[PDB]
Amino acid sequence: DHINLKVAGQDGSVVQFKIKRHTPLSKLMKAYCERQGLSMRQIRFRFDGQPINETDTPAQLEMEDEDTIDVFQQQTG
């Protein structure tokens, strides 16, 4: 079935990603990034501690229902 992944940025934004356990997290990152209007290389996604790979999946990272994903900004320079 569908899994609910809670993605949070740096504010009180609680978006619920209802995707499939076999759906690449790369698309999840892009979906959120596109909604914000930024480049996928301008931000960074992390799962608990380890950063998400461009080929990672909910079933790969052993993500459960109602899990959480952290979104950080890339340093200017």
Binding site: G12, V14, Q16, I19, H22
Partner: peptide
Amino acid sequence: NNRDPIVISDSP
């Protein structure tokens, strides 16, 4: 706080 639900479907 704001909550939005997004659904993504991928074809194998």
